[PDB]
Design a protein around this nucleic acid. Structure first.
Ligand SMILES: NC(=[NH2+])NCCC[C@H](N)C(=O)O
Length: 606
RNA sequence: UUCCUCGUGGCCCAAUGGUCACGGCGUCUGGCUCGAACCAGAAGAUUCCAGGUUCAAGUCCUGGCGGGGAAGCCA
């Protein structure tokens, strides 16, 4: 067809400058196909280079304004009224089978895609590629190391630890979906006096048979108990001659390689990782490596010392060595790299770890998912690596996030993650029981309840931008009405239920449905929404925000739910039921894809 | 005290610099004779304040105010 010929042409077209065109994939992103069509046709009309038009096309804030629009003033056409050009260019714009309409509105031109055209390409594509619908592959292998969660092995997970964990998990899924090779790394805080305190504390209150049940638990009590011994004694008996002192020594003792002090280390660490594996799996996360501050090689450490001098970065003061970053950035200030007693610090270890990682992986990019509470820390060791001469220093990125507020150890207002998950699970289980008929159709009610509960906990956290702080509130986790995780699960479940009720019409028939039977307003809106998923993923890797995907999932499910009320699959002609099944089936697949990307587990019944 | 960050409807929150702003909660009005954890409709706007940059500012700049965070031997 002429239309068939154009599609082939457009899918092979590269109009935007290589810089941006490199991200244009009309073959797997319908909106990029439309960007090509619109840029090409508007160029013929305006006389403006299509590569200048392409980046000026923006997605709209609301569907009432079209699918794409262009602000005329953005083309910088001197001596011309933007409003008039909009009217002139829109009036003669060829729609073909691509566009339903083109409209001038103030200094803008709105482009409305033809939904029937979209349905014919998008629906079969979603049903065929399924989980790969909005994905992409790279011409050349790119490897990224994403470090997330990274708790200190000495403490249980509280509401706060959830953040780095799911943000990193999301980013890992997103990068893999878009072609990258991803290394999921957990940088355990398993070194420093922090750990040297557990050593002595365990020798003091360590209970063999007790450490059997649960490591992190017993080890926590010991830490709590030992911290009081050095917090109650006060500044009375000399540090080392007391307790806290004979703890700093055990650390430097561990640095010397004291087989005994190290054997206990490898024990607490190994016991924590085994437990971690199950905890992270519950959140659909499997790390490739459980690294740690203890894993920094001596070579890198020594090399870092040499570079600090070779570059004249460090200078002695107060008996300790630090780096004055003020020369490079006023904000960075001064940072200590070696304590008076010659021991390494958190910052010193990060520099050496970055060096080991590059040597072992030769990454093209490395992302640290760390709280903004550590913005300065990250900004300092990033700069240091830069001034050290490393070319790859520029490939490091800090993805921060805000705090979960309402937590306090010295107040006991802290809420543990396991208790949150368990409580949310029980609440969702309760809601599940209210519908006797539906409940009786679930094989593992308890397990389904946990998946719904976790979706509630993750979504409440990912709804706003990462940078935002948010106070812990049980209602945030327990709510199920409105824009919540359970809302996404319910949408997925009833779409599955609709499919099952019409199991007489297999998915094979859907791809060959008569898509001209999806002309109702509600159907057209849903179709347009389906074609946006690829753009959303692309934008999500740019913002690194789960909310970018979450926001879309709610727009998607809101429309599906609106449609659910007026577009019935059952009790229709075979052809209309097949077409609507195809539309709902495609919507479910996209929801499934997005939910899985975020780290949730879509349920079939609830 | 210095620096960073956030401020959007009674509460939470979205936004490529691109048309006085997306949703949810609360509240009002309706709908259970393919899943009502839902839907249809209503209502609610000093995008914190004063200026600035720009053809165009919720978005960028300076300052103020309020919340939060950080700031030479913790992580
Ligand atoms: N490379 C890093 N510093 N990663 C983050 C470490 C976080 C540290 N373990 C703490 O609990 O705050």
């Amino acid at each position: 067809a002429s239309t068939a010929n154009m599609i082939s042409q457009l899918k092979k077209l590269s109009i935007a400058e290589p810089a941006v065109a490199k991200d244009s994939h009309p073959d797997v992103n319908i909106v990029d196909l439309m960007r090509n069509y619109i840029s090409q046709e508007l160029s013929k009309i305006s006389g403006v280079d299509s590569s200048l038009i392409f980046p000026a096309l923006e997605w709209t804030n609301t569907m009432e304004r079209g699918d794409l629009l262009i602000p005329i003033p953005r083309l910088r056409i001197k001596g011309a009224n933007p409003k008039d050009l909009a009217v002139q260019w829109a009036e003669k714009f060829p729609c073909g089978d691509f566009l339903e309409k083109v409209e001038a509105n103030g200094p803008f031109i709105q482009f409305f895609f033809n939904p029937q055209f979209l349905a014919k390409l998008v629906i079969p594509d979603i049903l065929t590629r399924k989980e790969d619908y909005g994905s992409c592959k790279l011409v050349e292998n790119k490897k990224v190391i994403i470090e997330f969660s990274s708790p200190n092995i000495a403490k249980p997970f509280h509401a706060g630890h959830l953040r780095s964990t799911i943000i990193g998990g999301f980013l890992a899924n997103l990068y893999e979906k878009l072609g990258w090779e991803v290394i999921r790394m957990n940088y355990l805080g398993d070194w420093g006096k922090q750990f040297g305190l557990l050593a002595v504390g365990f020798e003091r209150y360590g209970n063999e048979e007790a450490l059997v049940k649960d490591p992190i638990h017993h080890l926590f009590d010991v830490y709590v108990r030992i911290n009081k011994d050095i917090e109650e004694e006060g500044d009375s008996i000399p540090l080392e001659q007391s307790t806290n002192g004979k703890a700093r020594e055990y650390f430097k003792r561990m640095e010397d390689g004291d087989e005994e002090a190290l054997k206990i280390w490898k024990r607490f660490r190994e016991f924590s990782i085994e437990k971690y594996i199950d905890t992270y799996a519950r959140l659909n996360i499997k790390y490739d490596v459980y690294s740690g501050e203890s894993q920094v090689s001596k070579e890198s450490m020594l090399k870092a010392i040499d570079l600090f001098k070779e570059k004249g970065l460090t200078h002695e003061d107060k008996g300790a060595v630090l780096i004055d970053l003020t020369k490079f950035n006023k904000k960075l200030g001064k940072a200590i790299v070696q304590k008076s007693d010659g021991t390494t610090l958190y910052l010193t270890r990060d520099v050496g770890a970055a060096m080991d990682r590059y040597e072992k992986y030769h990454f093209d990019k490395m992302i640290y998912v760390i709280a903004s509470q550590q913005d300065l820390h990250a900004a300092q060791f990033f700069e240091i690596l830069k001034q050290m001469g490393f070319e790859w220093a520029k490939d490091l990125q800090h993805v921060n996030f805000g705090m979960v507020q309402g937590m306090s150890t010295r107040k006991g207002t802290v809420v543990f993650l396991d208790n949150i998950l368990e409580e949310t699970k029980e609440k969702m289980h309760e809601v599940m029981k209210k519908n006797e008929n539906k409940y009786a159709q679930i094989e593992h009610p308890e397990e389904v309840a946990d998946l719904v509960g976790i979706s509630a906990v993750m979504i409440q956290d990912m709804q706003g931008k990462r940078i935002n702080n948010y106070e812990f509130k049980w209602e945030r986790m327990l709510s199920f009405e409105g824009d919540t995780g359970p809302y996404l699960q319910y949408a997925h479940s009833r779409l599955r239920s609709v499919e099952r009720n019409a199991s007489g019409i297999t998915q094979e028939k859907w791809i060959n449905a008569d898509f001209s039977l999806l002309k109702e307003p509600a159907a057209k809106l849903l179709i347009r929404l389906l074609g946006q998923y690829p753009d959303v993923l692309r934008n999500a890797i740019k913002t690194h925000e789960p909310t970018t995907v979450v926001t879309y999932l709610f727009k998607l499910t809101h429309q599906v739910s609106s449609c659910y009320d007026v577009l019935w699959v059952a009790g229709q002609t075979e052809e209309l039921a097949t077409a609507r099944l195809a539309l709902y089936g495609a919507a479910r697949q996209v929801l499934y894809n997005g939910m899985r990307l975020l780290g949730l587990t879509p349920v079939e019944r609830m």
